[PDB]
Design a protein around this motif. Structure first.
Motif, PDB file in Angstrom:
ATOM      1  N   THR A 118      -6.456   5.069  -9.360  1.00  0.00           N
ATOM      2  CA  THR A 118      -5.682   3.893  -9.746  1.00  0.00           C
ATOM      3  C   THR A 118      -4.361   4.266 -10.410  1.00  0.00           C
ATOM      4  O   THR A 118      -3.391   3.506 -10.321  1.00  0.00           O
TER       5      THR A 118
ATOM      6  N   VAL B 193      -3.437   9.137  -2.206  1.00  0.00           N
ATOM      7  CA  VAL B 193      -4.183   8.006  -2.749  1.00  0.00           C
ATOM      8  C   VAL B 193      -5.324   7.621  -1.819  1.00  0.00           C
ATOM      9  O   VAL B 193      -6.392   7.205  -2.283  1.00  0.00           O
TER      10      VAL B 193
ATOM     11  N   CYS C 145       2.813   3.968  -1.498  1.00  0.00           N
ATOM     12  CA  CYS C 145       2.687   4.344  -2.904  1.00  0.00           C
ATOM     13  C   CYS C 145       4.038   4.575  -3.565  1.00  0.00           C
ATOM     14  O   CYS C 145       4.230   4.207  -4.730  1.00  0.00           O
TER      15      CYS C 145
ATOM     16  N   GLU D 178      -9.564  -0.744  -6.097  1.00  0.00           N
ATOM     17  CA  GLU D 178      -9.077   0.320  -6.971  1.00  0.00           C
ATOM     18  C   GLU D 178     -10.019   0.556  -8.144  1.00  0.00           C
ATOM     19  O   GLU D 178     -10.230   1.705  -8.551  1.00  0.00           O
TER      20      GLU D 178
ATOM     21  N   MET E 156      -9.103   7.619  -3.012  1.00  0.00           N
ATOM     22  CA  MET E 156      -9.954   6.451  -2.821  1.00  0.00           C
ATOM     23  C   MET E 156     -11.171   6.743  -1.949  1.00  0.00           C
ATOM     24  O   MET E 156     -12.128   5.961  -1.973  1.00  0.00           O
TER      25      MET E 156
ATOM     26  N   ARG F 255      -1.781   5.076  -7.800  1.00  0.00           N
ATOM     27  CA  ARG F 255      -1.287   3.881  -7.127  1.00  0.00           C
ATOM     28  C   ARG F 255       0.053   3.412  -7.685  1.00  0.00           C
ATOM     29  O   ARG F 255       0.787   2.712  -6.979  1.00  0.00           O
TER      30      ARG F 255
ATOM     31  N   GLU G   1      -1.778  -0.273 -12.669  1.00  0.00           N
ATOM     32  CA  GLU G   1      -2.669  -0.064 -13.806  1.00  0.00           C
ATOM     33  C   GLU G   1      -2.294  -0.972 -14.967  1.00  0.00           C
ATOM     34  O   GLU G   1      -3.171  -1.525 -15.643  1.00  0.00           O
TER      35      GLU G   1
ATOM     36  N   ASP H  38       0.805  -1.214   0.000  1.00  0.00           N
ATOM     37  CA  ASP H  38       0.000   0.000   0.000  1.00  0.00           C
ATOM     38  C   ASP H  38       0.843   1.272   0.000  1.00  0.00           C
ATOM     39  O   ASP H  38       0.297   2.356  -0.229  1.00  0.00           O
TER      40      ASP H  38
ATOM     41  N   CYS I  12      -5.270  -2.135   0.081  1.00  0.00           N
ATOM     42  CA  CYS I  12      -4.637  -2.293  -1.220  1.00  0.00           C
ATOM     43  C   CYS I  12      -5.084  -3.601  -1.858  1.00  0.00           C
ATOM     44  O   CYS I  12      -5.172  -4.631  -1.184  1.00  0.00           O
TER      45      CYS I  12
END
Ligand SMILES: Nc1ncnc2c1ncn2[C@@H]1O[C@H](COP(=O)(O)OP(=O)(O)OP(=O)(O)O)[C@@H](O)[C@H]1O
Ligand SMILES: Nc1ncnc2c1ncn2[C@@H]1O[C@H](COP(=O)(O)OP(=O)(O)OP(=O)(O)O)[C@@H](O)[C@H]1O
Ligand SMILES: Nc1ncnc2c1ncn2[C@@H]1O[C@H](COP(=O)(O)OP(=O)(O)OP(=O)(O)O)[C@@H](O)[C@H]1O
Ligand SMILES: Nc1ncnc2c1ncn2[C@@H]1O[C@H](COP(=O)(O)OP(=O)(O)OP(=O)(O)O)[C@@H](O)[C@H]1O
Ligand SMILES: Nc1ncnc2c1ncn2[C@@H]1O[C@H](COP(=O)(O)OP(=O)(O)OP(=O)(O)O)[C@@H](O)[C@H]1O
Ligand SMILES: Nc1ncnc2c1ncn2[C@@H]1O[C@H](COP(=O)(O)OP(=O)(O)OP(=O)(O)O)[C@@H](O)[C@H]1O
Ligand SMILES: O=P(O)(O)OC[C@H]1O[C@](O)(COP(=O)(O)O)[C@@H](O)[C@@H]1O
Ligand SMILES: O=P(O)(O)OC[C@H]1O[C@](O)(COP(=O)(O)O)[C@@H](O)[C@@H]1O
Ligand SMILES: [Mg+2]
Ligand SMILES: [Mg+2]
Lengths: 761, 761
Positions: free
Chosen positions: B361, B348, B160, B222, B352, B364, B369, B158, B202
């Protein structure tokens, strides 16, 4: 290392081949440069026999201002005394009286045979001389070995072991000057020009003359004409007339014979042509003209190089090594034992005496047989019943160079002979982009040999800009091979096409670069096609300029030569003309070097030499321009000499090709086409040509010994693209000879001389 | 250079990510190797708060025999005291009492946020502490700066700023062990396997698990499913049934939600599937199992590397440099400031929280992605209405490697998606010469992910022998691109086909090498596909062997690993298992080095540690074989320990691919196909593909940071063909870490640590 304490004798014998004076000058000036005593033997073996006054010690000024003179200042004579032991013993005595254990003989085949018999009997002659009481046993144990270095000075090139002899090129200059008088005129009426050369024993001059002039017919003793040649020749001239060709050239050697021993006279061929054809036939006989005139540039450079190497070989020669002949096979210096060369000469003479007569021409040397085959192939169009789907385009790229036309002519004929569909593109890569592609025939290149410049247009434009256009036209015309005759731009453009094989399928075609430029700056060759012409034009202007001060007047001339950053043209011209200095880019010089050279010139001009000459390459220095060197030399020489400037511009460019350039371009054009045909067969696959390896794009060479094919991608490492010249140039060792011949004390330990090689069977 | 006179604190907090013990071991041993004092803070921030007994100084043996243990021997605890300044001041006091100016925090996002707030207030906390009278002003000016090096230890990933975290790989090992229990069985009846992972915040574990298993459907927070997904999912499972596919896999993260905030439960999806489909649906919930088990090989190596680099970064850190997190982006070590990573984590989380939710996303990380897009593309065949005339053949060459099948599957799907006509050739170059080319569809690679070895046949035979047959079959089948999945033989064969483009027009096709071999000896990559699987199987055998002595007998095991001359497998396995020595070819050793190591082992074996382990690469030495080392160690260890031998043969070979290898081969197979399609469009000309530049034949990389395409011709310089390995291998620096962790005093000035890098937006 130096040859101190020993004396060198130099003599000339036989016909006075022009360029002998260059060889004598180099021999003398090397011998007293290395500290050896140099003795000039006047009248050759004559003065060797009588001796006494005819043998004089040389100084540096004894060979001053002779390099441009033909003949021999030493003088040559036919003496029968050297044939017999009675006179040869007297010759050995006179050599011993001066302590001359080292002899350089410059002469033809008979001269070198006499030198061989003189070495072979040197021990026996000394024994009989001490026995008779003309020399004590002491003073005879020393001088027990006589060192002989031979130099082939003759227009015949009859000495079998050697490929090129001193004076052959200049005899060819005389011959082609006469032929160019005929061919360059606007040919007005049907006339036949029958040229008689003095090749009584050897027909090499007749052969190379025929090749250079594109003679219709050739009578040489090596290959007499078949029975019934009378009709065959007259018919050849007949269809020549029917073509509209208004001039026929018949080269008949003095030694022209038929299949029997009966000689064929020039007068007979004249009357024969007159009777059956009615053409205005007149026989031109050169006679003494062949041995006359100034030596060509080639003769001066090569004579100087061989004379220097003769001296060096004469100092490093121990009692065990045999008599040698210093010569060049190709561009490479080599030493051949005198005994083997004499033996081959005897074998060819016996063969020519109706023993192995049809097989005597091969023993003459591969160059002779190849030259005769090339001549016959290019002379008359035989029917190529063979055909091939291949088609090739001939480009001319860069500056015009004397001899491009000769190369294109040979390429066209040879390609037609192999059945290829030959195209010629005008203006090089520009026309290839623009589609100026013209299918060419045999007669479309008729008479292109002697034309200077380029019949096809030349452009410097590289193919990268119009690459899409070029590949389009290659596809349209189906150009399977690309023959690019030109300078550095030719090589660079072919390099760009090869590199672009990654992108374009159509550029996967066999390419060949024939280096043709004045500057001789093309990597992968020793002689760019037309560099010889430029050198000859350059020295002629320099000799003219040096001739202009007269009598008392002490004057130096600063001459600026072309050649870009490549100093080749400057340096060789400086050697050929006896220039004091040849400032070039590859030998960077500062003001300290200039003051050294200027003080050296001033001291020289206080001596009895009164006409200094220094060459400047156009791009040797950013700041020390020709005006700078004019100001320097004129100021520092104030009260001693005057200075003048002459920038030889395009006087070195537009001239007709010298005979060397014609024959050279002729031969490598043939060889390029042979290689193209062989590579196309090696590469044809699956119904198409696909030339994608780097060895399928090569520069035709003559790199050291024989013709080579250096891939352009391999040459890219040794190519300075910024200066447009190779990184390692073979000719930089010639600077050492130039500086030595101008009294500059330069330790030439970097100079490499040709080692001993046995004759190639 | 050494960090003498300063003390390092190491603590673990949050969920006990397995591999934490490896990080703690490396931190401790590097800290006391460089002379610093190491203090173990038990229960994390808990023992930081209470302190006293909870802070103990470490020796070398304190972290002995923990690298294979999951969890954390230091222990971790949730403490609310560190949230408030009341407990944080007590934490600062207890650190000052031991002179601990250096703190390494191993934990998740909350742990590192607490560490960031602890640094940001360290000056204020010390000021308030001296103000209250618990520390004098002197002894507070020293310790004025607290150095924080963070390590992301969590299964969530989680955080980032970081791409890969400690314990993610091993959590994936647990997940895929459970999934392989289902998929490897002979699937007998229609059943639906609904796997619930603990990715509450996450969804990375859910995502990579779905990608590795080829899940039919994925619920991740996500990207919540669109409205009406109920019908869309049930229909997908319906056509899956109609295909005959007997098993559906639904990976639902704990944090699975819809487009609103309403969570989607695993029980809901179960009952949904049961109601509409009637498949036997059972929900598997891992729970604590994800954090369980041994750490994977990847986790042990990477934890050790990052723990070492954390300590080194902690010594070279001045008062000005900020708190950093030592992590690896790709294969490259890097340090990121703790503040920026915490800020991105907050951004993030806010995104979210229904702020920029559809665009959360991307923040993240690009890896998330890209992974989700690859998953969806490979999951369900969408109709490729695009078409292209291109066709490509997929080869498997060399030895089998775990993960070839995953690469082939992704290559097939991605190529079909782009409209290419994908072929698969069985037996590599043998079949390509023999025309064993088989057009492949989407479902022909169904379920190839988890299958080890090669579904296509592998052969080592290089293409040069049958090159005429290969080009004939390329012509017949019209192959425009060639995807070669394999080891050094794959690279070498592609190199031969590229070199043969000079000869064969048909080989002017785009080529791509996917390095797939156990040895990791393929130049142009850091990780050959399947090296991770071999390392994991190697350590597991070594762990079994080391555990067989049973804590009482003093025994050394000589374990011989595979890998040819490439020592990568031996050295990394030695790091993973704490081997005393890993003898390899790239570090030549003589008998002097052997006596040094043997005496070192004897001294170590007299201490508390009783199970020694030395690895030998099969081809490290010509004479010092495994038997030689056995005789040496057993003789010199007489009266101290016994010696045993175990040649891990093909135990390292035939395993199923680890989850890393599946995801890795999946991704680079996609990327290879993307690159193939882009290069084919870049190279299509005049109605045909003509790929002849060297950059049209590349090895897909992952060389330092991201995926690379190294041309094979460029890699040839750095390739040792005799030993079949690269000349410069990235992993030789890991020998120093192995030797340091084994108490070998080695001057590791050659080790390079990642420098500071800002987050990539
Ligand atoms: N077999 C021999 N022995 C001794 N001396 C010889 C022999 N042959 C020639 N000579 C001597 O060398 C001299 C010149 O030789 P020659 O008549 O053959 O001219 P050349 O060197 O061949 O030049 P060119 O071919 O151009 O006429 C002769 O006058 C003779 O003195
Ligand atoms: N330009 C030429 N000069 C001199 N002789 C020539 C020339 N062309 C042909 N000949 C001679 O005419 C003879 C026969 O000529 P032709 O080429 O037509 O038949 P051939 O069988 O091919 O002879 P070859 O190939 O050996 O030269 C040859 O022996 C050749 O010596
Ligand atoms: N230096 C020159 N410059 C310009 N035109 C020339 C030159 N020399 C010859 N020509 C022309 O070339 C024409 C072609 O006839 P030419 O005698 O030169 O060659 P050819 O004998 O007919 O064929 P080949 O070149 O093969 O020997 C001549 O009519 C002449 O006008
Ligand atoms: N903003 C914060 N300030 C101070 N301390 C914090 C903060 N967040 C978390 N902590 C401390 O770090 C400890 C663990 O953090 P957390 O609950 O988030 O687990 P984690 O590190 O994220 O691991 P995992 O995600 O696997 O569950 C907490 O008990 C708390 O003491
Ligand atoms: N294997 C899958 N797992 C989870 N969700 C999926 C999967 N396939 C499709 N979806 C979801 O179903 C929705 C629509 O699917 P579909 O691919 O058919 O249309 P789309 O326009 O191409 O959506 P998108 O391209 O954004 O992914 C998508 O938003 C996607 O999130
Ligand atoms: N480890 C394995 N070894 C051998 N066969 C296997 C293994 N795993 C799955 N299979 C087989 O692959 C077949 C194909 O179905 P599978 O579930 O594996 O993939 P799928 O869901 O249908 O398609 P996709 O691979 O794209 O996800 C299964 O019937 C199963 O028998
Ligand atoms: O560039 P190259 O190939 O060396 O051509 C040689 C000729 O070009 C030159 O640079 C000068 O050419 P231009 O007179 O047309 O400008 C000289 O070196 C020489 O006259
Ligand atoms: O040659 P690669 O590509 O390194 O293959 C790896 C495998 O080959 C090996 O050399 C042994 O293979 P074999 O057992 O078939 O003989 C080992 O290195 C390893 O098991
Ligand atoms: Mg003679
Ligand atoms: Mg967390």
């Amino acid at each position: 290392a130096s040859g101190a304490g020993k004396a060198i004798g130099v003599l000339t014998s036989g016909g006075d081949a022009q360029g002998m004076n260059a060889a004598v000058r180099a021999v003398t000036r090397m011998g007293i440069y290395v500290g050896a005593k140099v003795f000039l033997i006047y009248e050759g073996y004559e003065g060797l026999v009588e001796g006494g006054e005819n043998i004089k010690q040389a100084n540096w000024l004894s060979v001053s201002n002779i390099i441009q003179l033909g003949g021999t200042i030493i003088g040559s004579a036919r003496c029968k005394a050297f044939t017999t032991r009675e006179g040869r013993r007297a010759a050995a005595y006179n050599l011993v009286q001066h302590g001359i254990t080292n002899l350089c003989v410059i002469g033809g085949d008979g001269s070198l045979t006499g030198a061989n018999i003189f070495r072979s009997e040197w021990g026996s002659l000394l024994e009989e001389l001490v026995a008779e009481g003309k020399i004590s046993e002491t003073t005879a144990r020393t001088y027990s070995h006589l060192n002989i270095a031979g130099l082939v000075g003759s227009i015949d090139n009859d000495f079998c072991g050697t490929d090129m002899t001193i004076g052959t090129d200049s005899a060819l200059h005389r011959i082609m000057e006469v032929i160019d008088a005929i061919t360059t005129t606007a040919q007005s009426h049907q006339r036949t020009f029958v040229l008689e050369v003095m090749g009584r024993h050897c027909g090499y001059l007749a052969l190379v003359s025929a090749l250079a002039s594109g003679a219709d017919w050739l009578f040489i003793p090596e290959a007499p004409p078949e029975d019934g040649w009378e009709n065959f020749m007259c018919e050849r001239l007949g269809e020549t007339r029917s073509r509209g060709s208004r001039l026929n050239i018949i080269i008949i050697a003095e030694g022209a014979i038929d299949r029997n021993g009966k000689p064929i006279s020039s007068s007979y061929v004249k009357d024969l042509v007159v009777q059956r054809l009615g053409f205005d036939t007149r026989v031109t006989v050169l006679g003494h003209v062949q041995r006359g005139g100034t030596p060509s540039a080639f003769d001066r450079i090569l004579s100087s190089k061989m004379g220097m190497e003769a001296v060096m070989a004469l100092l490093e020669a121990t009692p065990d090594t045999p008599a040698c002949v210093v010569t060049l096979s190709g561009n490479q210096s080599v030493r051949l034992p005198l005994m083997e060369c004499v033996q081959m000469t005897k074998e060819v003479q016996k063969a020519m005496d109706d023993k192995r007569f049809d097989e005597a021409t091969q023993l003459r040397g591969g160059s002779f047989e190849n030259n005769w085959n090339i001549y016959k192939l290019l002379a008359h169009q035989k029917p190529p019943k063979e055909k091939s789907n291949f088609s090739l385009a001939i480009l001319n790229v860069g500056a015009p160079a004397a001899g491009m036309n000769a190369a294109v002519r040979s390429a066209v004929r040879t390609g037609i002979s192999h059945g290829h569909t030959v195209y010629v593109v005008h203006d090089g890569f520009e026309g290839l982009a623009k589609g100026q592609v013209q299918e060419v025939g045999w007669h479309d290149v008729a008479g292109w040999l002697g034309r200077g410049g380029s019949m096809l247009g030349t452009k410097r434009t590289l193919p990268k800009g119009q690459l899409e256009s070029i590949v389009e036209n290659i596809r349209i015309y189906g150009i399977h091979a690309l023959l690019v005759v030109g300078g550095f731009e030719a090589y660079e453009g072919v390099l760009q096409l090869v590199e672009a094989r990654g992108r374009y399928e159509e550029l996967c075609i066999v390419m060949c670069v024939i280096p043709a430029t004045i500057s001789n700056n093309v990597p992968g060759t020793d002689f760019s096609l037309g560099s010889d012409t430029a050198v000859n034009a350059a020295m002629e202007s320099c000799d003219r300029i040096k001739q202009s001060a007269s009598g008392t007047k002490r004057r130096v001339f600063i001459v600026e030569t072309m050649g870009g950053y490549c100093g080749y043209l400057a340096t060789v011209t400086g050697i050929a003309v006896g220039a004091d200095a040849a400032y070039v880019f590859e030998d960077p010089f500062n003001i300290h070097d200039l003051k050294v050279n200027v003080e050296h010139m001033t001291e020289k001009m206080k001596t009895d030499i009164q006409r200094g000459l220094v060459l400047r390459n156009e791009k040797c220095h950013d700041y020390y321009t020709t005006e700078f060197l004019y100001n320097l030399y004129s100021s520092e020489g104030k009260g001693v000499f005057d200075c003048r400037t002459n920038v030889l511009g395009h006087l070195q460019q537009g001239g007709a090709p010298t005979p060397f350039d014609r024959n050279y371009g002729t031969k490598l054009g043939v060889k390029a086409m042979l290689w193209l045909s062989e590579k196309l067969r090696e590469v044809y696959r699956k119904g198409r040509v696909f030339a994608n390896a780097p060895d399928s794009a090569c520069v035709i060479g003559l790199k050291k010994k024989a013709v080579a094919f250096s891939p352009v991608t391999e040459l890219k490492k040794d190519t300075d693209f910024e200066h447009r010249m190779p990184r390692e140039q073979w000719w930089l060792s010639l600077r050492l000879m130039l500086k030595m011949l101008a009294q500059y004390r330069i330790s030439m330990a970097a100079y490499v001389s040709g080692e001993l090689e046995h004759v190639t069977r």
